Amino acid sequence: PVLRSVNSREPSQVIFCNRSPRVVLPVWLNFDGEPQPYPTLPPGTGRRIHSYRGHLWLFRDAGTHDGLLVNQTELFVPSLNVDGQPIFANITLPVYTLKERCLQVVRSLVKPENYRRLDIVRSLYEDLEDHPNVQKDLERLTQE
Amino acid sequence: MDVFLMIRRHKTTIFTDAKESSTVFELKRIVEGILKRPPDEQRLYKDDQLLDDGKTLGECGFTSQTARPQAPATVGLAFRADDTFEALCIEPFSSPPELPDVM
Amino acid sequence: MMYVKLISSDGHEFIVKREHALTSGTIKAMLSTNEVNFREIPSHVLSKVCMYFTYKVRYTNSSTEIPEFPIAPEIALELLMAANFLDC
Amino acid sequence: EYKLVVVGADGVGKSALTIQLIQNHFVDEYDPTIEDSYRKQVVIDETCLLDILDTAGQEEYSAMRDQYMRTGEGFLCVFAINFEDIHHYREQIKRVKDSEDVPMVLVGNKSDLPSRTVDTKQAQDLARSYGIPFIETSAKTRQGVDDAFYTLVREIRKH
Ligand SMILES: Nc1nc2c(ncn2[C@@H]2O[C@H](COP(=O)(O)OP(=O)(O)O)[C@@H](O)[C@H]2O)c(=O)[nH]1
Ligand SMILES: [Mg+2]
C-alpha cells in the first residue's frame, strides 16, 4: 500500500487543533494502510496527542464523514520533532463545492429513505446517496 | 479589514468588496465605475438611514462580522435625475417554497 | 474591474466580478460576453449562488481557518439544483 | 462487581500489589511472564467483587490485547519509586477506553526502598495534571496497597 504509516517507533509529539465548526474524527492510517478511528475533538478544542514519525493521519467530520483539511492539505505526516517543540496540525474546513455543501445540508435534513421523495432531478438522488467514504478518498489520494 | 457588500437599487445588485477603512465616497466612485453615474447623482443608504460621503464604512456599520463574503451587508442606492433624488427603492428577491415535510 | 452581469428568472440583475463568476463551469462556457441570462434560476437562489462565488476566491488558498458556508433549509433544494446546473 | 486492571512497567511490582490485596502475602520473585486475574469479595464504604487483572507479557498492540484492556473500567498505573514510561501507559489506556477521564489511579509502588529516583511532589504534580489520585504504596510493607485498589473503586463509582 502506498498510503500507510511507517513503523518508525520514533515518538513525535503533535498538536491536533480543531479550527472547524464540526466534530473532528482523527483517522490514523495504520501500517497496512487501513484507516483507524481515534477520539473525537469538539469544535475549538486542542489536544497534544503523542504519535510517531512517518505516521499518516487524516481528519473527517465525525458524524457525516465529510472531508476536512489539515495544514492546507488532505493528509498529515508528523515531521522530525525539533528541540522538543510540538508539530502543529490545524484541522480546518475545505472550500467545498457549492453542490457538495448543498448535499451536506440536504443529507442532514432528510433521512436517507426520503431522498427519492425530494423534488430534484434523479441524478441528484444518486449524488445524495453517494455518502462520503474515507476508503474512496484514499484511492484518489494514492493516484495523486 | 475587508467588508463585503451588496449595493442594491430597484432590480440591480452589485457584489463588491471594500476595505472597512475606505469611505462612502470612494465606494460611490466604485459604483461610478460599474453603473456609470457621478457621486453627486448617487445616494448611499444603510437600511433607511442616508450615509454621508466622509464617514468610513466601519463608522456606518459595515464591519468584518457584519459584512462577510458568505453573508454580505446591503447598501441601498438612489440615483438623481433632473436634480431630484429618487425615493430609495429596492425590489425584493423571490421567496422559496415551504419546506417539504420530509425536510 | 472586469464584471459580468447575471440575470435571474424574475429579471433581477446581479453584477459580480468575472473571476468570481468563473467559479461556475457553465458560466465559463457561456462567456467563452459580459452578460448571462438564466431563465430557470430565481433571484433568491442566484443571489445566494453569488455569495458562494465571493466565499470561494476569498477562502480558496487560505492558510488559516475558513467559516462555514451557511445554507438555510428552505433554499437548500433550489440551491442544489442551481449548483448542479452551474457546476460550482 | 468492579473490574480493575493493574498496568505498569517491568519489575515495577504489579503482581506483588494484587497478591498483597488478595492473598495478603508478599511474593518474592513472582513470575514476570505469567498473567492471571483474581476475584475478591471486599467491603468498601458496600459489599462488591473487585476483580483484579495483573498484567504481564510482551508489548502487543493487536486488536485482541486492546479489547482485553478495554474491558477493565478502572486502571492502576504503577511505577517504581526507584523513569517516565507512565505517560505511554496512560496514553494507551486512554486510546482503548476512548476517554480522557477513564477512572484511573497513579500508584508509585516500592515506596519502602530507601533509594527514590522520583520526587514524590513530581508524581502528585503529574497526578494532578492527569486529574487522578496518587496513592503511595508498599507491597512489602503492605501499606497503601488496599487504598490504591479501593480509591480506584471510588473513582469508578464517581464516573
Ligand atoms: N521491596 C519491595 N519490593 C517489591 C515491592 N513490590 C514489588 N516488589 C518486588 O519487585 C519485583 C517485581 O515482581 P512483579 O510483581 O512480578 O513485577 P511486575 O512484572 O511489574 O508485575 C518482585 O520480585 C517483588 O518482590 C515493594 O513494595 N517493596
Ligand atoms: Mg505481573
Neighbours of chain B (3+ CB pairs under 8 A): A, C
CA neighbor of C17 nearest in space, from C5, C9, C7:
C5
Look at residue A96 and give its three-state secondary structure. Answer: coil
Residue type, C17: K
Q: In one letter, which amino acid is D39?
A: R
Amino acid at D24: N
Contact D95 A50 (CB under 8 A): no
All domains in chain B, ordered by first residue: 2-103 (3.10.20.90)
The atom of ligand 1 lying closest to the CA of D28 is 25
Asked if B15 and C20 count as a contact pair (C-beta separation under 8 A), the reply is yes
Alpha carbon D80 to chain centroid distance? Answer: 12
Cite the DSSP H helix spans in B20-103: 24-35, 57-60
- Among the bound ligands, name the one nearest to the CA of residue D54: 2
Contact C59, A95 (CB under 8 A): yes
What's the grid cell of residue A21?
465548526
Which residues on neighbouring strands pair with residue A47, listed in sequence order?
Answer: A16
Direct distance between the N- and C-terminal alpha carbons of chain C, in angstroms, rounded to an integer: 22
Cell numbers placing B60: 456606518
Residues 6+ apart with CB under 8 A from B43: B50, B77, B78, B79, B80, B85, B88
- The reported resolution of this PDB entry, expressed in Å, is 2.2
Kindly state the helix (H) or strand (E) to which residue A43 belongs, with its residue range: none
CA pair distance D116, A58, nearest whole angstrom: 43
Run of H or E residues at C11: none
Among the partner-chain residues D87, D88, D98, the one whose CB lies closest to the CB of A39 is D98
Which residues 6+ apart lie within 8 Å of A70 measured at CB? Answer: A57, A58, A59, A76, A89, A90, A91, A92
Whole-angstrom distance, CA of residue D106 vs CA of residue B73: 56
Tell which CATH classification among 3.40.718.10, 3.40.50.720, 1.25.40.10, 1.10.750.10 matches the domain A98-128: 1.10.750.10
Asked whether the beta carbons of residue B103 and residue A109 sit closer than 8 angstroms, the reply is yes
d(CA C17, CA C22): 9
Q: Technique behind this structure?
A: X-ray
Through-space distance between the first and last CA atoms of chain B, rounded to whole angstroms? 38
Q: Which domain holds residue D108?
A: 2-158
* Spatial separation of the C-alpha atoms in residues D113 and A115, rounded to whole Å: 69
SS3 of residue C43 by DSSP = helix
d(CA A43, CA A46): 9
Q: What whole-number distance in Å separates Cα of residue C37 and Cα of residue C52? A: 18
Most distant pair of Cα atoms in chain C: their distance: 39
SS3 sequence of A19-34? CCCCCEEEEEECCCCC
The amino acid present at A61, given as its one-letter code, is: D
Determine the Cα angle at C63 with ends B7 and B69, to 5°.
15
Question: DSSP alpha helices (H): ranges in B9-101?
Answer: 24-35, 57-60
HSE toward the beta carbon, residue A3, CA cutoff 13 A: 21
The answer to whether residues C38 and C81 touch, using CB atoms and an 8 Å cutoff, is no
DSSP D159: -
Contact A96, B70 (CB under 8 A): no
Do A16 and A26 contact (CB within 8 A), yes or no? yes
Calpha distance B90→B93 (Å, rounded): 9
Q: Give the C-alpha separation, A66 to A61, whole Å.
A: 5
Helix (H/G/I), strand (E/B), else coil: C3? strand
CB D50 within 8 A of CB D38: no
Query: Which has the closest alpha carbon to A88: A37, A46, A30, A53?
Result: A46
- HSE toward the beta carbon, residue C42, CA cutoff 13 A: 14
Strands annotated E in chain B: 2-9, 12-19, 42-46, 49-50, 73-81, 84-85
DSSP state for residue A86 in the 8-state scheme:
P
Please tell me the distance from the alpha carbon of residue B76 to that of residue B90, in angstroms, as a whole number: 7
Measured in angstroms, how far is the CA atom of residue D95 from the centroid of ligand 2? 22
Centre a 10 Å sphere on the Cβ of residue B68 and count the other Cβ atoms it contains: 19
Burial B84-95 (b: 16+ CB within 10 A, else e): eeeebebeebee
Please name the residues in contact with D28: beta carbons below 8 A apart, sequence gap of 6 or more: none
Q: 3-state DSSP call for residue A13? A: strand
For A113-124, the DSSP string reads GGGGGSSS-HHH
The CATH number covering residue D130 comes to 3.40.50.300
In 3D, which of C32, C54, C52, C55 has the Cα closest to residue C41?
Answer: C52
Domain ranges in chain A are 11-93, 98-128
Any atom of ligand 1 within 6 Å of the Cβ of D29: yes
**Phi and psi for C71 in degrees, rounded to 5?**
-135, 115
CATH of domain C2-88: 3.30.710.10
Say which amino acid occupies D114. P
Strand (E) or helix (H) holding C47: helix C43-58
The domain segmentation of chain C, as residue ranges, is: 2-88
In which region does residue C61 sit, left (phi positive, over 0), alpha (psi from -120 to 50) or beta (all else)?
left
Give the position, in ligand 1's atom list, of the atom nearest the Cα of D30: 16
The set of residues, in sequence order, having a beta carbon less than 8 Å from that of D49 and lying 6+ positions away, is: D1, D2, D39, D40, D41, D42
Number of structural domains (chain D) is: 1
Q: How far is A32 from chain C (nearest CA, A)?
A: 31
Query: Is CATH 2.60.40.780 correct for A11-93?
Result: yes
Neighbour tally for B72: CB within 10 Å: 24
Q: How far apart are CA A109 and CA A103, in angstroms?
A: 10
